[PDB]
Design a protein around this motif. Structure first.
Motif, PDB file in Angstrom:
ATOM      1  N   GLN A   1       0.801  -1.215   0.000  1.00 16.07           N
ATOM      2  CA  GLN A   1       0.000   0.000   0.000  1.00 16.07           C
ATOM      3  C   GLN A   1       0.837   1.270   0.000  1.00 16.07           C
TER       4      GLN A   1
ATOM      5  N   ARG B   1       1.334   2.651  -3.491  1.00 13.74           N
ATOM      6  CA  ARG B   1       0.039   3.098  -3.993  1.00 13.74           C
ATOM      7  C   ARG B   1      -0.340   2.447  -5.320  1.00 13.74           C
ATOM      8  N   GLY B   2      -0.308   3.218  -6.404  1.00 16.84           N
ATOM      9  CA  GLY B   2      -0.909   2.816  -7.657  1.00 16.84           C
ATOM     10  C   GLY B   2      -0.002   2.224  -8.711  1.00 16.84           C
TER      11      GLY B   2
ATOM     12  N   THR C   1      -0.592  -3.673  -8.690  1.00 15.50           N
ATOM     13  CA  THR C   1      -1.935  -4.209  -8.522  1.00 15.50           C
ATOM     14  C   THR C   1      -1.985  -5.082  -7.276  1.00 15.50           C
TER      15      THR C   1
ATOM     16  N   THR D   1     -10.570   8.420  -5.241  1.00 17.60           N
ATOM     17  CA  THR D   1     -10.503   7.345  -6.223  1.00 17.60           C
ATOM     18  C   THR D   1      -9.235   6.512  -6.075  1.00 17.60           C
ATOM     19  N   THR D   2      -8.145   7.135  -5.638  1.00 20.91           N
ATOM     20  CA  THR D   2      -6.857   6.461  -5.604  1.00 20.91           C
ATOM     21  C   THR D   2      -6.769   5.506  -4.416  1.00 20.91           C
ATOM     22  N   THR D   3      -5.723   4.677  -4.430  1.00 20.47           N
ATOM     23  CA  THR D   3      -5.492   3.746  -3.329  1.00 20.47           C
ATOM     24  C   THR D   3      -5.198   4.488  -2.031  1.00 20.47           C
TER      25      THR D   3
ATOM     26  N   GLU E   1      -6.275   7.510  -1.241  1.00 21.19           N
ATOM     27  CA  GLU E   1      -7.525   8.106  -0.793  1.00 21.19           C
ATOM     28  C   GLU E   1      -8.497   7.071  -0.246  1.00 21.19           C
ATOM     29  N   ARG E   2      -8.371   5.807  -0.659  1.00 18.12           N
ATOM     30  CA  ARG E   2      -9.210   4.760  -0.088  1.00 18.12           C
ATOM     31  C   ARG E   2      -8.915   4.550   1.391  1.00 18.12           C
TER      32      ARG E   2
END
Ligand SMILES: Nc1ncnc2c1ncn2[C@@H]1O[C@H](COP(=O)(O)OP(=O)(O)O)[C@@H](O)[C@H]1O
Ligand SMILES: Nc1ncnc2c1ncn2[C@@H]1O[C@H](COP(=O)(O)OP(=O)(O)O)[C@@H](O)[C@H]1O
Ligand SMILES: Nc1ncnc2c1ncn2[C@@H]1O[C@H](COP(=O)(O)OP(=O)(O)O)[C@@H](O)[C@H]1O
Ligand SMILES: [Mg+2]
Ligand SMILES: [Mg+2]
Ligand SMILES: [Mg+2]
Lengths: 359, 165, 359, 165, 359
Positions: free
Chosen positions: C43, C46-47, C50, C185-187, C189-190
């Motif tokens: 995490q 982040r993005g 996957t 929307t992003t990881t 921000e989740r």
């Protein structure tokens, strides 16, 4: 042109007398929002509505919903007017006498059928096999019945009912398919699992030996394609799902299997006729269409019966619709036209006429 | 919801097509095998397209394959509603079901496509009892017999109009 | 010093036996570039990668990624050598017997643990509440389970699984926060939205009455500060996000709510034990930590159960980690040292030893 | 299964409580009406809680309601095992049965609740012959006489300890 | 303090001599897994085990299971040591002489009872009614007996046995309750139906008239609450279930009803004593506790007997346990202490002593 309607616990078989196969086979459900949908229309809406079975266990419990199924049968499925054709209805074994009169009253007053008749589902299956004496193991959707019949008359004291049929096997297959990572929970996915069950499931002659075979290789694995194009693989679940018929403890049930239920109903008959019932065991219903179920039943009953008895399991290739096919031929006979309950006779004797004309 | 209503002629035709009444073989030959519905001149009602229909008696004498000639009745650059009485056979039953067909070709004008699409959910609710719907947006999606068979019963259908697939 | 590992669907709880709280609580995710990151490492980038859940729904589906999580647990989180400490593992209800043997094989051959044990998560929660008979509503991250237990044994035929838990609620709160103009929307921000859910969300006793209250004033509005210093305001989304537990149709799901799932599992048990299950409903998991969820569950089940039944919902304050705390106390007992599966026993009976030593 | 064993003192006490031997009335007064079991200091055995018991001879002289005073012996913030000899009368019989009571109050520490619950199925297996089990998790579920009567025979119980419900 | 044990076909009545009611009344069943449970313990496990009746029809067939019931009776139910109290046993009519010696041998060698005695169940019932001459219609759980007694001695050639009692009525009520949509199939649900039968069933004086009354109104319908709170409604099944006693054809039996069995046993006696038997018909057992059974028996026997005969049916209010109550009073008499079979007498004469001391 008479109409033959087979009111099964989960599926309704309807058609015209003289035809080889029923014209319409649709689920016998009525759906209402969580304003009334019957049959495949109730399944097309999927999860918005709630489904109810009016004839859930062969015995009609909700007559208001049963009339909706009959109205859907005549006008939407058969696409005929019920007032222009005689209708032959079928009933489950141990059907109360009140339900027979209610069936007759609805046909003559709500649908105004010119003629009407009631037949027992088990007796039609036995006659379709060329027998008048024997025991019929009718496994349908919501109920399984073992009906011993002697000279064309079912013995009511020996009829055993098992609440374990294809509906419970479909739910069990959904439960055990989640162990492979799949998820079938919705109403639409339940129909997919039912299609898998009817195409890839089979009864293993030796369950423990078959389980060892599936755990040492991949020769028993089959591939199934989902409606959206995805492909899933099913292995030992092919023979584990129908094994619940012989081992109901897989479903948490204390009841005996279909082989012990058949043996118990034979043991409830007269000792002088038990020898004939052992050699005249006839399978009927859709849940008896698994490959290898006749051989498994023969092996299981043999272990229960004395070694001097000859065990013969009869599994005709068309036993799935043997109730309807037998009714269609019977209703198409020119000599059978005198056996109908006419509307004139109903107006004189009332709904009680069915007891003396259809027994 | 465009508010377009369904004319009483279409309702009467559909009711005659759905439920079959006991009649002489002369009247059986007058039953409709297929029929087309179109908008009126004022675009206020769904009316029957005159002359664009197939009779049961025409099948086997002047019409060899009822589905092939029914497709020919569909206009190339215009939208249309269709009601086809499909006779098909599955692996365990011989079926006769009504099929509601929405013909909206790409070559049709945008005005025709918008009105027919927005009023389709209103006419279909009046034609109760139809369980099969075929939405075709090009000639290749309706001319093939196997396309209709897939919508009827998928791979379970083994024959269509008395002819194997 | 034994190790207790709680392999949850979305969060892994690990620690030492005898401690009040787990030492490490990290996400059970294995990430690979769009070369392998586990836990918070996956995490942190982040993005660019996957994320995959090997135990997504309580049942392990990818054993290769599961070993990566276990290796990360022992060496990076617990910072101990697995070969020096016995390890107690927890499993989800309805876990296939093949997974239990695979867990035993990996523990003894890949990590060489001196001793090893398996416990059911639902049974540990019930024991931690001082009960041996009852139904546990375990709502975690990726799965919700209602496990009726009678005298310390779960009833497998009555266990119901719901694929609706905190992971779906975090996504739903992400969706409904966009109606206020915010964009998550992003990881990264989740994780912010998940923090908001765990701090400001609550279950309303009357959803419709609460909605009217929030639309007529601003007493239900709360302020949250983003990591970069920006402050956002959340109003009616506080009680709408956990409302999806009782109204799954908010997420487009046809399944029943947690109150109906609990009621349905009770009705699948024996009639003589349903009275005990009604008064012994125990909540477990992180998704049951919403304030007011015990009162809402009591009100909803009461409307479903007969009026003569006493409905009692047990929501202990420490129910978030009741599975781990129950396992840590059990593993720290001197009398429990003879319940361990030793490596000597594994070398003789193989992986099948777990079936007769851990049931 | 926590592996906690049952001490020989508990087994001996239960055996004396279950089967009544022909004895002088002096020894009959020494029979145990109720008794509490607790964990040892090392938490390896289930032992008798010293001083927490009711004798048959105490009933009617110092103890008026044997069930009311037995409940008072239950600790408020600790778990306990109990063995109560219930004397009750149904509509067609006068019964005397042993009741196994699991007292696990919500106020008790979680360590006590976990050990007592996980070791309950082991001690109850050693105490063969008990047909009644009461699991109380709060003071309201054990202080009421009607609660015990419902577990004994449901609505068939008309009297408890010689007093009508 | 003597012990009185009434070994019935389906229920065992035990207690202490001098008490008004038996202390323990538990089913006489031994359960083994599908390792040995006796009485209510065998019914608590429900379906995991199979039940066997060792004394199924009043006559002990499995002496190994009979000792388990007796051991359970003394230690678990009566909570006394059998070696410290004399035991009075009861036996069914037409009990073979080998069984009497086997019962005596078990009591003195397995349990070491200081004294022992055997009494006939029918004779104790007749004595409890203040009669020495009469016919006792003892309808229990697994068997029904009509025992004509003259001057305290049963006439063995006139004793008739009927395999139709409360056990068959409980099964019949389960079968006919499914016609209303209910489903009672499990062992736990059988005990619920038995409770319904013992609370809501009654014998109709005129069955056909009562059937018309129930079909024209709802005044005969009663509501019953299930253990989990559900409420069911029972109508004409209240008097249809006990009607099988007078019409065994409802169960598929060729035997005669209890009224014809009583009449047939009277006609097997001497013609000079038939007048006394007609006016001294005494009902005994639990299956004779249906309200209106004495009036129905009086009406049915009157139609069979000559019109000059005076028919009197005696139904004492405490006839359910008249066998045990009569035995308890007899065993509590100080003058009865010399009727006991002492251990010293058994050591000299062997098990054959029972034939000359208890007849
Ligand atoms: N080929 C097949 N193999 C296994 N099961 C089948 C097959 N065909 C139908 N079934 C099952 O039979 C059930 C219903 O069959 P049927 O006897 O018509 O029910 P009913 O008589 O109760 O209407 C369905 O639930 C379906 O799953
Ligand atoms: N205080 C809280 N309030 C609401 N939800 C919470 C709280 N704490 C944790 N959660 C939720 O619980 C979920 C995981 O809890 P847990 O039961 O440990 O998961 P699992 O058991 O599936 O590993 C997370 O998705 C998180 O959103
Ligand atoms: N009040 C009642 N009404 C109807 N039947 C009863 C009643 N009480 C008991 N029974 C029936 O009596 C049967 C057993 O009675 P009993 O004569 O004591 O048994 P046994 O055959 O062991 O002597 C049971 O099956 C029960 O269903
Ligand atoms: Mg059928
Ligand atoms: Mg968890
Ligand atoms: Mg008796």
């Amino acid at each position: 042109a008479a109409l033959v309607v087979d009111n099964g616990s989960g599926m309704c078989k309807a058609g015209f007398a003289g035809d080889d196969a029923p014209r319409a086979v649709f689920p016998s459900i009525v759906g209402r929002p969580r304003d009334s949908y019957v049959g495949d229309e109730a399944q097309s809406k999927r999860g918005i509505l709630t489904l109810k079975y009016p004839i859930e266990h062969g015995i009609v419990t909700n007559w208001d919903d049963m009339e909706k199924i009959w109205h859907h049968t005549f006008y939407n499925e058969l696409r005929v007017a019920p007032e222009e054709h005689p209708v032959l209805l079928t009933e489950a074994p141990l059907n109360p006498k009140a339900n027979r009169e209610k069936m007759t009253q609805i046909m003559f007053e709500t649908f105004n059928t010119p003629a009407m008749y009631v037949a027992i589902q088990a007796v039609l299956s036995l006659y379709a096999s060329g027998r008048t004496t024997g025991i019929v193991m009718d496994s349908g959707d919501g109920v399984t019945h073992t009906v011993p019949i002697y000279e064309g008359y079912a013995l009511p004291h020996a009829i055993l009912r098992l609440d374990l049929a294809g509906r419970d096997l479909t739910d069990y297959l959904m439960k055990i398919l989640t162990e492979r990572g799949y998820s079938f929970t919705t109403t639409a996915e339940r129909e997919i699992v039912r299609d898998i069950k009817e195409k890839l499931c089979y009864v293993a002659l030796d369950f423990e030996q078959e389980m060892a075979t599936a755990a040492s290789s991949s020769s028993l694995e089959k591939s199934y394609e989902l409606p959206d194009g995805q492909v899933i693989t099913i292995g030992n679940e092919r023979f584990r799902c129908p094994e619940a018929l012989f081992q109901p403890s897989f479903l948490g049930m204390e009841s005996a299997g279909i082989h012990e239920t058949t043996f118990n109903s034979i043991m409830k008959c007269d000792v002088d006729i038990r020898k004939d019932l052992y050699a005249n065991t006839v399978l009927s219903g859709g849940t008896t269409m698994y490959p290898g179920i006749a051989d498994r039943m023969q092996k299981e009953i043999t272990a229960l019966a004395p070694s001097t008895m000859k065990i013969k399991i009869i599994a005709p290739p068309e036993r799935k619709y043997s109730v309807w096919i037998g009714g269609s031929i019977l209703a198409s006979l020119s000599t059978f036209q005198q056996m109908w309950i006419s509307k004139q006779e109903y107006d004189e004797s009332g709904p009680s006429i069915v007891h003396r004309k259809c027994f | 919801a465009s508010g377009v209503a369904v004319s009483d002629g279409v309702i009467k035709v559909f009711n005659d097509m759905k439920v079959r009444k006991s009649s002489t073989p002369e009247e059986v030959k007058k039953r409709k095998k297929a029929v087309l519905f179109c908008l009126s001149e004022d675009k206020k009602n769904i009316i029957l397209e005159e002359g664009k229909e197939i009779l049961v008696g025409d099948v086997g004498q002047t019409v060899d394959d009822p589905y092939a000639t029914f497709v020919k009745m569909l206009p190339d650059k215009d939208c249309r509603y269709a009601l086809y009485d499909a006779t098909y056979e599955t692996k365990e039953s011989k079926k006769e079901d009504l099929v509601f067909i929405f013909w909206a070709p790409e070559s049709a004008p945008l005005k025709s496509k918008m009105i027919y699409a927005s009023s389709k959910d209103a006419i279909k609710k009046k034609l109760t009892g139809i369980k099969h719907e075929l939405q075709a947006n090009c000639y290749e999606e309706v001319k093939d017999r196997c396309t209709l068979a897939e919508k009827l019963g998928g791979s379970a259908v083994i024959s269509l109009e008395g002819k194997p697939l």
